[PDB]
């Protein structure tokens, strides 16, 4: 039978009998209200279930209905714009259908709606008898104005097409393909189902080559991430995380966005779910909602501990499904520290050996195996395509202690750290990225891209990092030397470090000219600031060696208009001024500064 | 609809051990069911089914297991879990930690019966916090301001006045009265000694505020399960009053440190192994089930705001109870031993205290337009004043500048006038802000660098 | 080359048989086919964490930081599968690689490995932050077999004396550098400034090298003497007068 029966209850643990063919880690529905749980032990014809919901009122002899599956995702049309929790309950459909402010115990709404009808177009040259394999695109659903949703044959499925549906409107429960292999027939609808703990297969996993642009001058120049990359950010109150989340959502070269809350505070989760629907972007000269290309997983701190832990596996499995269509995906996890605390609580319920700081022995392997799902890929199946998933995971070191087991593991794994900083936010220095603590390890992989497309940039990045580091060495000298007694070369360093810091690293995201900064504007600004620095250094070092010296005071007194034009470069608007117009103006500052230095020399 | 079937009574007690009675031959045992025991002398006790297995049930008795035997003791299984009657008639009433009346009024007529475990609020239905809750205490309202739908703990230690502060917040709290009968309080107190419990009950009658207040008292020698039930009765009442009767409810939960001591005991009675620092491994998920019964919700005009109150051992903020509370709640109000020793009341220390939602509660149309600027400038002056006061003992007062002597004058008058307040003195936010400006006027207006020129122009000068 | 690969997404219990498959292959090549074999084992830290994961699931006795109570004896069955044998012309050399958690050499993985292996090469975050390469710090590092692999007819006669005097000068230079952080440069004596000059020249000339530069032992020893001559010969108190008189005047 599909039913066993409750033999006993002790807190969240249920023991059931007549469970003989039930497999390890299957999901089950317990009692007359159908509470969800998972099988954690087998013994004889009995099973031990870890129930996710309150077991209060469950009785001996109550039905235990078994699902033949582990924890898994419905993958199909209806995911874009959706709100889910960590076990894929549709929070907005539950709200709409129940007319309640609460989540009912043992609620059993399907994650994708089976009453919405979708416009479906088949792949045109598939016919009865066509040979078809896992990952093959056999039709497209027009889900909205932005996302064409590509219907694929599941992994671990293959055969010869015995039926394919004509163009039309279909429920997610309608059969749209049948195929046959070894005389056995498989019938398929628009929804496939996949286990959250199994990595979705690919033809090949590839090195990451192309930047994940954000439109920020810092990040995109000094600390780049690739498409398929991995990043961590500090998750703390004052630092200002939202610039990462909103730049990814509005301005990245991602095709799809997945956001995971994984045990957040109720009032913080409410702020995300209020704010995200109000975000918009301009597509083909028309403004569109972010929720046409976005899905949210949301979990407050009083959701089931099984959901708070499943959350990142639900979010990465959704991300891998859109990668397999040939999209580029960014996934954000709102705090991996809240996920790790849920993992710790589960190991505590299981009475496991407490290892490092009370966290289970597998913590670092679970983090490693999760971040190993990031990357660029060659997809399974016939139409030849590439996709990627890029992961940003926030992490919350207690009091800023990076020796925390979750933070220590995370920075041991990730290839970028964007160190957002409360002290910079208190200075009104926005975006609040600390350039001393932050790093990127993708700078070699991007070398071929920058060489091909920009060519001048790698030298400029190298000089700019040195100038910002020299100022941090000169500061302790200035505290003794009293600024005036410093060398003129080093006064140039300090004041150009201030020029880069105030006019390149800072970027006011509320202002129309600086909401997004394209990479041509970014390299153009830096090119001029470093050109000015080299000419100012050359004027001092040519004269001060034996002639009547030039000084940084003489340069400022002679060149104050050039220095004002340099501070004005950030005000150029990429929408009102064309690429060629901005480039021509930035060439005019180079001509003007070269003329001004030639008149000084 | 109704439960309708007659009850079964068993004399099938197999064994008795610690707080637990074990019965066999029980018909389809229900987990967490309430049962009534009658003892050999006719005394009555009650308990709850702690585990079931086949025909066996084990009951934790709320009162003792003394005088119980296997032969004459009978147990009546009621057929159902714990549900509380709930109504608006509960405002003006005093109850014990099992919901029984202790005020010589009658027992509650239900408008409904609710399961005390509740259900989680859907994240889609919770809307962001907004306007102020006015506590009447300047160190809170002026600088650690509380939003409708916030949750914010008071952190304290043994022998500090946190119950006198809680009682003052209960007597004084309300809405700001800009330019209501829709405000109520649920006050819950866990593991209270009889001196403290008599103080709470006496102080709210004597100072005549009971018509807004539902009060639940659990004493230090009441059953430890009634301490587990007490926050759940209180929050099941606040959920009826807020999300069905559309009130703004303030909930005060007193010694969550006493609650955790009972949680550790019920965990030990289940024969679980002790977790990290000796508390149950699931204590985060348990505390989060209390603290997230809070907020504003879409389409209903009520809200629940929580003020948990906690005692820390060794004055240590890194113990599991304050530490896990910090991951769930959004701020802290810090009660200080040094201000208490200096004879200041309320001894609230504003430098480590924070309300993370303060910007959502304050400003034009919610308090007054200058509130954010005054709060920022009072914090900035006090943080400098404590630093000048430290260097005065190193450099001597003759090495201090004229500006150091202004911070040294502000520091004394801030603590005597802004922080120091009577236990029966109630200041509106407007009075709090006016006391704030009397202190800022100690300085030349060039010193007030956290305040913009528009706010200085409207509020720095005195007027008739 | 032979490669056995288990990745971050492959099963964690394969990791406890992976190095035993590699060492069984090395034993056939060395002790039946008479090859010389070099064996590289990558994150023994991942092996030891997979061993902790398995042993915790069996409820076996814990040692320090929850590692298996027998982990020394287990790691010894891996590391002792090395060396030479009488009458056979092959050999196995093992170079395992460890990640020390939070950089702590006293953590159970580096601790029990250092009790079994014939020394260690130690890679230092502070040298890497300063952009020195290779980031090898000599003071925590050891070779137990060095003492009888060097000297006359083995390498060069000075090798042991040079090595021990470089250890002494580097250790004293590091103690002057710690002292100067308290007292400042103005308090140093002229002898302190010699050890502090040696420290700076040693890290630039001896330690720093670059990824395809390939120095002989003789080049290494002559770089060594160019740094030891910073001092008067009377300060070279590890070196006997016979070695000084022959090699120092150059």
């Amino acid at each position: 039978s599909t039913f066993g029966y409750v033999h006993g209850v002790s807190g969240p643990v249920v023991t059931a009998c007549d469970m003989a063919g039930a497999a390890m880690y299957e999901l089950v529905r317990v009692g007359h209200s159908e509470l969800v749980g998972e099988i954690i032990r087998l013994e004889g014809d009995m099973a031990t279930i870890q129930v996710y919901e309150e077991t209060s009122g469950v009785s001996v002899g109550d039905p235990v209905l078994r699902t033949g599956k582990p924890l898994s995702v419905e993958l199909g049309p209806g995911i874009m714009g959706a709100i889910f929790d960590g076990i894929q309950r549709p929070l907005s459909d539950i709200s709409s259908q129940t007319q309640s402010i609460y989540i009912p115990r043992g609620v059993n709404v399907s994650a994708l709606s089976r009453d919405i009808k979708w416009e479906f177009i088949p792949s045109k040259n598939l016919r009865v008898g066509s040979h078809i394999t896992g990952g093959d695109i056999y039709g497209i659903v027009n889900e909205n104005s932005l996302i064409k949703h590509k219907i694929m044959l599941p992994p671990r499925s293959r055969g010869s097409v015995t039926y394919i549906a004509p163009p039309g409107n279909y429920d997610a429960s309608d059969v749209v393909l049948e195929l046959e292999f070894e005389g056995v027939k498989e019938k398929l609808s628009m929804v496939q189902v996949w286990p959250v703990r199994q990595v979705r297969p690919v033809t090949e996993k590839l090195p990451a080559n192309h930047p994940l642009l954000t439109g920020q001058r810092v990040l995109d120049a000094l600390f780049p991430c690739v498409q398929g990359g991995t990043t961590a950010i500090p998750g703390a109150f004052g630092c200002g995380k939202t610039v990462i989340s909103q730049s990814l959502s509005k301005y990245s070269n991602s095709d799809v966005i997945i956001y995971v809350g994984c045990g957040e505070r109720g009032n913080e989760m409410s702020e995300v779910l209020r704010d995200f629907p109000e975000l918009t972007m301009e597509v083909d000269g028309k403004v569109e909602s972010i929720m046409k290309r976005t899905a949210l997983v949301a979990n407050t701190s009083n959701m089931p501990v099984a959901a708070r832990e499943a959350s990142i596996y639900t979010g990465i499995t959704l991300s891998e499904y859109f990668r397999d269509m040939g999209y580029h995906v960014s996934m954000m996890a709102d705090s991996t520290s809240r996920w790790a605390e849920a993992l710790r609580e589960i190991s505590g319920r299981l009475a496991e050996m407490p290892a490092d700081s009370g966290y289970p022995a597998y913590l670092g392997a679970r983090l490693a195996s999760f971040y190993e799902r990031a990357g660029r890929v060659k997809c399974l199946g016939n139409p030849e395509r590439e996709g990627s998933v890029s992961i940003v995971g926030a992490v919350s070191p207690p009091g800023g202690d990076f020796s925390d087991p979750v933070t220590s593991a995370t920075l041991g794994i990730v290839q970028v750290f964007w160190g957002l900083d409360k002290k910079l936010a208190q200075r009104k220095h926005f975006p609040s990225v600390n350039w001393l603590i932050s790093y990127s390890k993708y700078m070699r992989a991007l070398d071929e891209y920058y060489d091909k497309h920009f060519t001048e940039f790698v030298p400029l990045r190298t000089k700019a990092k040195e100038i910002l580091q020299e100022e941090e060495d000169l500061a302790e000298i200035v505290q003794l030397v009293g600024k005036a007694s410093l060398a003129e070369t080093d006064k140039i360093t300090l004041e150009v470090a201030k020029l880069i810091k105030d006019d390149f690293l800072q970027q006011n995201g509320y202002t129309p000219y600086d909401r997004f900064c394209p990479f041509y504007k970014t390299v153009g600004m830096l090119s001029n600031m470093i050109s000015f620095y080299d000419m100012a250094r050359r004027a001092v070092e040519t004269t001060a060696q034996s002639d009547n010296k030039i000084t940084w005071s003489i340069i400022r007194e002679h060149m104050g208009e050039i220095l004002y034009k340099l501070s004005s470069m950030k005000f150029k608007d990429p929408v009102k001024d064309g690429e060629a117009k901005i480039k021509a103006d930035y060439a005019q500052l180079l001509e003007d500064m070269q003329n001004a230095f030639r008149s000084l020399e | 609809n109704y439960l309708s079937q007659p009850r079964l009574t068993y004399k099938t007690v197999s064994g008795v051990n610690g707080p637990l009675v074990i019965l066999d031959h029980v018909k389809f045992p229900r987990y967490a069911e309430i049962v009534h025991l009658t003892l050999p002398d006719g005394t009555k006790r009650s308990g709850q089914v702690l585990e079931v297995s086949g025909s066996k049930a084990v009951v934790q008795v709320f009162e003792g297991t003394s005088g119980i035997d296997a032969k004459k003791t009978s147990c009546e299984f009621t057929g159902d879990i714990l549900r509380t009657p709930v109504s608006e008639d509960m405002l003006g009433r005093v109850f014990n930690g099992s919901g029984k009346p202790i005020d010589r009024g009658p027992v509650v007529l239900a408008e409904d019966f609710l399961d005390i475990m509740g259900q989680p609020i859907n994240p889609q239905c919770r809307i962001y916090p907004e306007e102020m809750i006015q506590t009447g205490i300047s160190a809170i309202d002026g600088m650690n301001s509380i939003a409708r739908g916030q949750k914010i703990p008071i952190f304290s230690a043994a022998g500090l006045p946190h119950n006198e502060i809680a009682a003052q917040i209960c007597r004084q709290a309300g809405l700001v009265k800009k330019s209501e009968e829709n405000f109520a309080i649920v006050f819950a107190a866990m593991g209270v000694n009889m001196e403290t419990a008599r103080f709470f009950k006496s102080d709210f009658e004597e100072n005549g505020s009971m018509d807004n207040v539902c009060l639940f008292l659990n004493l230090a020698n009441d059953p430890t399960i009634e301490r587990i039930i007490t926050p759940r009765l209180a929050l099941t009442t606040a959920e009826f009053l807020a999300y069905q009767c559309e009130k703004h409810v303030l909930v005060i939960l007193t010694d969550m440190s006493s609650y955790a001591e009972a949680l550790r005991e019920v965990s030990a009675a289940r024969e679980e192994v002790p977790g990290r620092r000796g508390f149950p491994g699931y204590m985060y998920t348990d505390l989060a089930t209390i603290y997230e019964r809070a907020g504003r919700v879409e389409g209903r005009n009520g809200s629940i705001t929580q003020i948990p109150i906690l005692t820390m051992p060794n004055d240590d903020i890194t113990h599991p109870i304050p530490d896990l509370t910090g991951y769930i709640t959004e701020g802290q109000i810090y009660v200080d031993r040094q201000l208490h020793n200096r004879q200041i009341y309320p001894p609230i220390n504003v430098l480590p205290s924070l309300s993370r939602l303060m910007k959502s509660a304050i400003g034009e149309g919610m308090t007054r337009k200058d509130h954010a600027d005054v709060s920022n400038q009072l914090y900035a002056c006090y943080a400098i004043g404590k630093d000048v006061q430290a260097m005065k003992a190193v450099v001597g007062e003759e090495a201090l500048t004229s500006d150091d002597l202004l911070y040294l004058e502000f520091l004394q008058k801030f603590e005597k006038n802004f922080i120091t307040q009577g236990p029966y003195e109630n200041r509106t936010v407007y009075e709090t802000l006016d006391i704030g400006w009397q202190l800022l006027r100690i300085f030349p207006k060039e010193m007030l660098k956290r305040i913009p020129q528009s706010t200085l122009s409207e509020f720095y000068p005195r007027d008739s | 080359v032979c490669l056995f690969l288990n990745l971050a997404n492959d099963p964690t219990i394969e990791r406890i048989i992976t190095p035993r498959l590699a060492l069984t292959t090395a034993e056939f090549l060395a002790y039946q086919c008479e090859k010389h074999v070099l064996v590289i084992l990558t994150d023994m830290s991942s092996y030891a964490e997979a061993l902790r994961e398995v042993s915790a699931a069996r409820e076996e006795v814990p040692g320090r930081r929850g590692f298996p109570g027998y982990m020394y004896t287990d790691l010894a069955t891996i590391y002792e599968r090395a060396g030479r044998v009488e009458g056979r012309n092959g050999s196995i050399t093992q170079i395992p690689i460890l990640t020390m958690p939070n950089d702590d050499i006293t953590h159970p993985i580096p601790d029990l490995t250092g009790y079994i292996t014939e020394g260690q090469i130690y890679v230092d975050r502070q040298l890497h932050n300063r952009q020195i390469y290779p980031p090898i710090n000599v003071l925590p590092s050891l070779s137990r077999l060095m003492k009888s692999a060097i000297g006359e007819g083995m390498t060069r006669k000075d090798h042991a004396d040079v090595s021990n005097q470089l250890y002494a000068c580097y250790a004293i230079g590091k103690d002057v550098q710690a002292m100067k952080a308290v007292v400042g440069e103005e308090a140093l004596t002229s002898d302190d400034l010699l050890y502090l000059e040696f420290l700076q020249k040693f890290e630039k000339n001896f330690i720093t090298q670059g990824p395809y530069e390939n120095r002989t032992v003789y080049e290494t020893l002559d770089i060594g003497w160019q740094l030891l001559r910073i001092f008067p010969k009377e300060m070279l108190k590890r070196i006997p007068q016979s070695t000084l008189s022959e090699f120092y005047p150059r």
């Binding site: 009475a351 050996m353 407490p354 | 024969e271 192994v273 002790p274 | 409820e59 006795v61 814990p62």
Partner: peptide
């Protein structure tokens, strides 16, 4: 923690032996 487990196991074994003895009786 390791000493408080093992006590749980030895108690579980004693219960199972007592249940087997009640099946013998």
């Amino acid at each position: 923690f390791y000493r408080l487990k093992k006590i749980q196991e030895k108690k579980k074994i004693i219960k199972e032996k007592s249940e087997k003895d009640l099946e013998r009786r």
